[PDB]
């Protein structure tokens, strides 16, 4: 379920483009840093579960 | 990627095509201005003649 | 009062005008070039954006 | 001679003005992809738990935000410069008019 939610969210962000209007100015998204893991660690996590 | 390469050459072609048109009119203006001096020169030629 | 220095003064004014005009023309040329460069750079970088998002979605689907 | 130079000053004054107008038209065209990137980064914040990650798309999205910021700053500098050149050129036209008078 977690990966399905992430896939849907990333699919939406890929679907939106410069022509779309649901956009907004979101200042500071660069300076904010919220991260828990790297892709290699995520892949290892899924591998260990399997 | 082929579309993106196709897009790149489209933008490059467009910019140079823009400038070429910008040169033809500037050369066209210098043509009419050059030609207009000939018609005036018949004036002082007549006075001198 | 300055019989022939008058000609030097008019010459000075004229050449000042010419130099300013030449600099202006150079600046217009550079402005057009930098505009084209920035436009192309932004488009190349956004298509790289799209390709990398697509790759990540593919890997997520596989897992 | 002053007449001909005044005419040339007129040419360059409009070239400066047209440059100003096309450049302001360019900045607003450049504005939108920045907020596109910011919306995408908000969606990245929406990612849940482990799937929220420092992936290549997120890193290069941050780089994209930085790059559009830089291009906006450079374009604004060029605007200011060409405005200054236009003002100077109008001043030269004024001097040539006075000398012709």
Interchain CB contact of D76 with C (< 8 Å): no
Cβ count near A31 (within 10 Å): 8
The tokens of C35 are what? 């505009």
Measure in Å the smallest separation between the Cα of D73 and chain A Cα atoms. 16
Experimental method: cryo-EM
Provide the resolution (angstroms): 3.5
A46 touches chain C (CB under 8 A): yes
CB contact at 8 A, A18 and D33: yes
Is residue D26 within 8 Å of C36, Cβ to Cβ? no
Chains A, D: CB contacts within 8 A come to: 83
Q: Count CB-CB contacts under 10 A for residue D82.
A: 23
D27: number of Cβ within 10 Å: 14
Q: Which of C35, D55, C2 is nearest to A9 (CA)?
A: D55
Residues of chain C with C-beta less than 8 angstroms from the C-beta of B11: 39-40, 43
Cβ–Cβ under 8 Å, residues A1 and D37: no
Question: Rounded distance, CA C5 to CA C35, Å?
Answer: 46
Given a contact cutoff of 8 angstroms between Cβ atoms, the answer to whether D40 and A5 are in contact is no
How far, in Å, CA of C14 to CA of D6, rounded?
A: 10
Confirm if A38 and D53 have CB atoms less than 8 A apart. yes
């Amino acid at each position: 379920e977690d990966k399905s939610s992430a896939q849907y969210i990333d699919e939406n962000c890929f679907n939106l483009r410069s022509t779309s209007d649901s956009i907004s100015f979101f200042h500071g998204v660069e300076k904010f840093d919220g991260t828990v893991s790297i892709p290699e660690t995520w892949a290892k996590f899924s591998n260990d579960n399997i | 990627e082929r579309v993106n390469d196709l897009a790149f050459w489209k933008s490059e072609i467009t910019h140079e095509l823009d400038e070429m048109i910008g040169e033809t009119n500037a050369l066209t203006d210098i043509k009419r201005r050059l030609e207009r001096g000939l018609i005036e020169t018949e004036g002082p030629l007549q006075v001198s003649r | 009062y300055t019989p022939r220095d008058w000609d030097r003064s008019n010459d000075l004014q004229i050449r000042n005008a010419e130099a300013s005009r030449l600099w202006a023309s150079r600046l217009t040329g550079d402005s057009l070039r930098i505009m084209q460069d920035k436009d192309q750079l932004i488009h190349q970088m956004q298509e790289g954006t799209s390709r990398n998002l697509g790759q990540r979605l593919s890997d997520l689907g596989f897992w | 001679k002053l007449q001909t130079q005044l005419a040339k000053i007129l040419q360059e004054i409009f070239q400066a003005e047209n440059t100003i107008m096309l450049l302001e038209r360019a900045i607003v065209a450049k504005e939108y992809p920045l907020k596109m990137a910011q919306t995408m980064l908000a969606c990245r914040t929406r990612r849940p738990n482990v799937e929220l990650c420092r992936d290549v798309p997120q890193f290069r999205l941050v780089n994209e935000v930085f790059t559009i910021d830089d291009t906006l700053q450079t374009l604004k500098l060029r605007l200011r410069e060409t405005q200054d050149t236009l003002q100077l050129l109008v001043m030269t036209k004024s001097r040539l008019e006075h000398e012709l008078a």
